[PDB]
Amino acid sequence: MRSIYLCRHGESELNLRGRIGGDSGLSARGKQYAYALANFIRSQGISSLKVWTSHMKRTIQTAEALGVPYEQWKALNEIDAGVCEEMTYEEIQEHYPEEFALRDQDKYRYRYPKGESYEDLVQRLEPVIMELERQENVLVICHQAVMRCLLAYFLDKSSDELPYLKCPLHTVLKLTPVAYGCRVESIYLNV
Amino acid sequence: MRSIYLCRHGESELNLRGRIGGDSGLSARGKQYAYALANFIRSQGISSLKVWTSHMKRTIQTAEALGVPYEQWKALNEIDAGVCEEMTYEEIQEHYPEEFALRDQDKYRYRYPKGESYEDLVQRLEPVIMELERQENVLVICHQAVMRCLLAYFLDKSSDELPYLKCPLHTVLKLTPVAYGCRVESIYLNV
Numbered sequence: 001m002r003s004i005y006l007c008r009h010g011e012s013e014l015n016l017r018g019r020i021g022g023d024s025g026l027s028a029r030g031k032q033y034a035y036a037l038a039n040f041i042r043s044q045g046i047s048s049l050k051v052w053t054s055h056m057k058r059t060i061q062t063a064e065a066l067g068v069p070y071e072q073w074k075a076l077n078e079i080d081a082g083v084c085e086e087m088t089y090e091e092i093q094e095h096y097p098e099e100f101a102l103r104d105q106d107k108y109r110y111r112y113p114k115g116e117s118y119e120d121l122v123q124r125l126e127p128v129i130m131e132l133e134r135q136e137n138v139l140v141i142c143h144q145a146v147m148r149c150l151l152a153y154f155l156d157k158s159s160d161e162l163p164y165l166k167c168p169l170h171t172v173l174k175l176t177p178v179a180y181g182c183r184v185e186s187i188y189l190n191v
Numbered sequence: 192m193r194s195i196y197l198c199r200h201g202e203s204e205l206n207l208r209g210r211i212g213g214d215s216g217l218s219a220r221g222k223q224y225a226y227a228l229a230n231f232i233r234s235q236g237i238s239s240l241k242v243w244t245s246h247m248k249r250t251i252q253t254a255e256a257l258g259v260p261y262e263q264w265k266a267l268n269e270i271d272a273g274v275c276e277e278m279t280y281e282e283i284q285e286h287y288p289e290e291f292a293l294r295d296q297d298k299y300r301y302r303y304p305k306g307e308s309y310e311d312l313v314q315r316l317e318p319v320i321m322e323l324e325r326q327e328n329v330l331v332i333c334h335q336a337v338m339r340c341l342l343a344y345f346l347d348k349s350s351d352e353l354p355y356l357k358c359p360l361h362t363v364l365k366l367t368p369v370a371y372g373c374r375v376e377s378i379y380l381n382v
């Protein structure tokens with residue numbers, strides 16, 4: 001039976017430092033998770049697993065720790081925050097006060113100045129989902145907003161539930177598509 | 192005419208780093224706001240101004256720049272994050288995934304493990320609201336949650352919308368209560 005493993009990149013510099021978006025590398029702890037992930041995968045004993053990542057350094061560095069070939073997707077790249085890229089929630093409140101609240105009205109269709117929205121991201125992911133269906137066993141090392149859209153698809157969640165799906169760092173969601181839908185198991189790798 | 196100048200302490204080191212709670216001091220930019228705030232106060236030509244701060248290093252440090260006396264109130268201390276003290280919103284999502292989700296159901300009544308809620312803080316702020324009410328011109332250098340509770344009281348906002356009120360850093364809100372309720376004047380101090 002096939003299964004799709006979804007998880008985020010290891011903790012990044014910006015993650016640890018309190019900032020969103022950007023293209024930072026893995027933190028010391030992030031690298032540790034990469035090795036923990038490699039251990040978990042090997043533990044699964046999967047037949048010919050294909051590893052997918054985005055173009056972001058964080059996803060790549062995580063895959064590098066798997067010692068197996070990985071395919072890069074520009075579509076798996078994290079949502080563009082635009083003007084408030086690499087900013088903290090406090091900086092966003094200070095420099096873009098009305099935008100911060102505008103989001104609360106509709107987090108799915110909300111779009112940051114010069115950036116994407118969850119609705120946009122869902123659309124940009126269409127190609128990936130298509131391929132995900134054609135594959136057997138796949139490990140998609142991605143991002144928060146991305147993992148939420150992917151998860152929402154397989155778990156048939158509404159556009160409302162989507163922006164609030166649990167996609168923490170160092171947690172691998174193993175989806176096993178079945179007749180009634182798709183089973184899910186949460187594996188937290190503590191490092 | 193009497194005004195209640197509510198403002199948050201100047202940016203702290205922890206604010207800049209991504210973390211909630213703690214007892215850190217003002218960053219260099221935070222200190223700059225302390226000085227800007229002092230300049231603003233003088234320009235106001237205010238009569239017998241009373242400065243109130245909390246016992247936190249960040250509020251004291253802001254008051255010092257004013258060059259005027261100020262009284263400290265433990266009741267004005269920021270809401271306790273309990274076990275989540277000094278964590279980032281990612282660390283919370285990772286180590287306390289269920290807690291994070293539960294909070295989203297009721298931001299007002301959500302209480303941190305070993306900490307408090309907005310409801311708890313309201314009770315704690317009761318005597319502050321009273322003295323503040325029976326006072327004249329008053330400057331209160333406080334924190335985010337605290338400023339929200341105070342503001343909601345004077346603007347007669349429901350507990351429902353309380354946690355979402357705009358309380359960005361480096362912004363002083365001049366509150367002048369008048370017959371139909373209370374008037375506000377948002378003063379942004381760019382530094």
Ligand SMILES: Nc1nc2c(ncn2[C@@H]2O[C@H](COP(=O)(O)OP(=O)(O)OP(=O)(O)O)[C@@H](O)[C@H]2O)c(=O)[nH]1
Pocket residue numbers: 020021078079080081088089090100143144145146148163164280
């Ligand atoms: N308002 C607010 N936004 C935050 C905070 N921390 C991160 N954000 C940003 O708020 C938006 C959505 O928040 P979340 O649903 O928690 O995460 P996300 O949508 O997957 O965002 P990305 O960070 O782009 O993945 C994103 O642009 C986040 O980067 C915070 O404390 N407050």
Ligand SMILES: Nc1nc2c(ncn2[C@@H]2O[C@H](COP(=O)(O)OP(=O)(O)OP(=O)(O)O)[C@@H](O)[C@H]2O)c(=O)[nH]1
Pocket residue numbers: 089211212269270271272279280281283284291334335336337339354355
């Ligand atoms: N989980 C999470 N908590 C955050 C974030 N930004 C701030 N917090 C903390 O989450 C709680 C509620 O968030 P907010 O309503 O934005 O702010 P607050 O309640 O005034 O927070 P305090 O800073 O504790 O007063 C508080 O304890 C915040 O410190 C974030 O992005 N994620």
